Structure 1
Amino acid sequence: SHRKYEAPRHGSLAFLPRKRAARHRGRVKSFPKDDPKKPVHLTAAMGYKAGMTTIVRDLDRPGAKAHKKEVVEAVTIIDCPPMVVVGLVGYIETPRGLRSLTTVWAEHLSDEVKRRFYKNWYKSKKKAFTKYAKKYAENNGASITRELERIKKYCTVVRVLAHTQIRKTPLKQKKAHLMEIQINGGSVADKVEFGRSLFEKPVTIDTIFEKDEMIDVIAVTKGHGFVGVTARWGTKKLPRKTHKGLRKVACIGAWHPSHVQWTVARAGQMGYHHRTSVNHKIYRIGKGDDEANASTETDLTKKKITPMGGFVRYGEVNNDYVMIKGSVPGVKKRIMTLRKSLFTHTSRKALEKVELKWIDTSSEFGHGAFQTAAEKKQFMGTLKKDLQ
């Protein structure tokens, strides 16, 4: 018969299958729609998640209960070393979809991006792109000019290839991350000129994004392995000492068809899924060369974004960093893709101006109450090892 008391489904069918992601680096499924009257710009970037911290923000939100008051908010720090552009990929439109037509690479490629093409870089002869580097020299780059004009003549979507400088991060990985970033705005010839002018040049994060802008974060979430139905889907636990498991679903079926349905909660892989989260506000784009990039106009303490004793399981941030309000999918040390919003925003929160008053730099390795080592030294006073 019918179900006596109605209840909504556990979990969403929009995120099936709950399998592991096919690739560690997040995939930009869709780019913002291209307007040829707009100026040329890049639409995405990558960074690495350092960790989280606490801020105090002077809120300017008219009509809110916390208007003209101080709010405490959680933010995420993403270390963003500059990206090097080493390629240009052309796309054409076919009745089967977008198709890549050709790819033009730069003359000189770093060992960081050359490691990406190899699984055993230490045993290799490192021969990658060696014959390709000679077509810049033979016939004055006639083949390079031919492919570039092929992109200018036949292609409609132009994407640069950009790789991260992972050597500036505290990660033990030396293999860099390479991705396609779509050039939006202008004509196709303008895009190709823009890309060739950007070969072999480092691009920083502040030339792609700006403070107070809402972006999207694409990554792979924290993996949990094989997890049962109670934590995987949120089903109600069976009573105590239920025979054959109580952290289970009592009925995986009581009705026709004589099958198990795809909508029934089953134990399996939980976490390590590919997720795209939208509407994340950028609160601060701090510069690596600044020695006071975690100091506000009211907090005059000259200090950096790195917490006291460093980030837990990441290290110390010494490059340009992005502070994002809230949380992002992924773990520490994980590659993150920051993307422009696909649509014009419809909220006043995306038009608000963020005025930070304090950033927490205390230790996340415990109940740290000091923001700098000098503060701890002044509070504790003189110790035995000082006279020793």
Structure 2
Amino acid sequence: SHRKYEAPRHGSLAFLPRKRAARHRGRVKSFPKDDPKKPVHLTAAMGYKAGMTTIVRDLDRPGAKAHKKEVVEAVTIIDCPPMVVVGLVGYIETPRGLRSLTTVWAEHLSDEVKRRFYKNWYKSKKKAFTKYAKKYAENNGASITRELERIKKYCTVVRVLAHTQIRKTPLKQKKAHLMEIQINGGSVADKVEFGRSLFEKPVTIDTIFEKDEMIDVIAVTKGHGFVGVTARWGTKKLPRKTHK
């Protein structure tokens, strides 16, 4: 027989697979649509979360009830030491999707980035990019400039490899974090020239973002061990005299 009284379902099926995230660092899935009429610019950053605090300001919203009156709002503070660019990548379009064909690195790598490629760094020999480094200063880097010309010839989107300077934070961790940030600009030649000019140099957050701008935040939520249906989905509790 039918249900007696109607009610909406508990929870949402959009966020359905409720398993632990595959990777600790948050993953960006899409980037803003490219437009070749603005100057070249980056489209992402990454930092660490400090805490929350309270502010006070007055509102400017004509026709509202609290117009031209003081309000109290809560805010959050994100630590953002400068990041360092290490290399860039190019992708091509195939009838099966996007795929990367080349990548170029900088001459010198920090010990922070070099820590990322190892699981036991203390007892290793730290030979990460030793043989790769000799590709510089050999035929004046003809091999290196060859793939850069290839990217200028065959690629359609260009991303840049950047990492954080975690040593300037009170964190105990010494392993840095690495990601790619897409460059939206006029042309592929301009993109590659601008990206290459940023090798082993720091970039500050004020060049990327600016005041009163509407942004997005990606991270991994707080974890709880293993919970029942009442807290996981939010169902009604059974009467007090229920057995089992």
TM (norm. structure 2) is: 0.97
Equivalent-residue separation in structure 2 for 1:109 and 1:241 (angstroms): 67
Equivalent-residue separation in structure 2 for 1:62 and 1:96 (angstroms): 52
* Deviation of the 1:62 alpha carbon: 2.1
Query: Deviations for 1:326-367, whole angstroms, at most 9, x for unmatched residues?
Result: xxxxxxxxxxxxxxxxxxxxxxxxxxxxxxxxxxxxxxxxxx
* Deviation of the 1:15 alpha carbon: 0.7
1:224 alignment partner, SS class: coil
Q: Relative to 1, partners in 2 of residues 1:241 and 1:122: Cα closer, same or farther, differing over 3 Å?
A: farther
Query: Deviations for 1:229-267, whole angstroms, at most 9, x for unmatched residues?
Result: 11111111111142xxxxxxxxxxxxxxxxxxxxxxxxx
* Deviation of the 1:33 alpha carbon: 0.5
Q: Relative to 1, partners in 2 of residues 1:238 and 1:107: Cα closer, same or farther, differing over 3 Å?
A: same
1:113 alignment partner, SS class: helix
* Deviation of the 1:64 alpha carbon: 2.2
TM (norm. structure 1) is: 0.61
1:72 alignment partner, SS class: strand
Query: Deviations for 1:58-115, whole angstroms, at most 9, x for unmatched residues?
Result: 2222222221111111111000000100010111111111101111111111111111
Structure 2 gap ranges (5+): none
Equivalent-residue separation in structure 2 for 1:143 and 1:11 (angstroms): 56
Equivalent-residue separation in structure 2 for 1:113 and 1:189 (angstroms): 28
Query: Deviations for 1:311-335, whole angstroms, at most 9, x for unmatched residues?
Result: xxxxxxxxxxxxxxxxxxxxxxxxx
Percent identity for Structure 1 against Structure 2: 100
* Deviation of the 1:227 alpha carbon: 1.1
* Deviation of the 1:24 alpha carbon: 0.7
2:174 alignment partner, SS class: coil
* Deviation of the 1:154 alpha carbon: 0.7
Give the root-mean-square deviation of aligned CA atoms.
4.2
* Deviation of the 1:21 alpha carbon: 0.5
- State the match for 1:119 in structure 2: 119
Equivalent-residue separation in structure 1 for 2:61 and 2:116 (angstroms): 46
Equivalent-residue separation in structure 1 for 2:160 and 2:73 (angstroms): 36
Q: How many residues are aligned here?
A: 243
- State the match for 2:174 in structure 1: 174
Query: Deviations for 1:196-231, whole angstroms, at most 9, x for unmatched residues?
Result: 011111011111111100100001000011111111
Structure 1 gap ranges (5+): 243-387
Q: Relative to 1, partners in 2 of residues 1:144 and 1:241: Cα closer, same or farther, differing over 3 Å?
A: farther
Equivalent-residue separation in structure 1 for 2:165 and 2:235 (angstroms): 44
- State the match for 1:216 in structure 2: 216
Equivalent-residue separation in structure 1 for 2:207 and 2:145 (angstroms): 28
Equivalent-residue separation in structure 2 for 1:103 and 1:113 (angstroms): 16
Runs of 4+ in 1 over 3 A off after TM superposition: none
Query: Deviations for 1:356-387, whole angstroms, at most 9, x for unmatched residues?
Result: xxxxxxxxxxxxxxxxxxxxxxxxxxxxxxxx
Equivalent-residue separation in structure 1 for 2:94 and 2:83 (angstroms): 31
1:143 alignment partner, SS class: helix
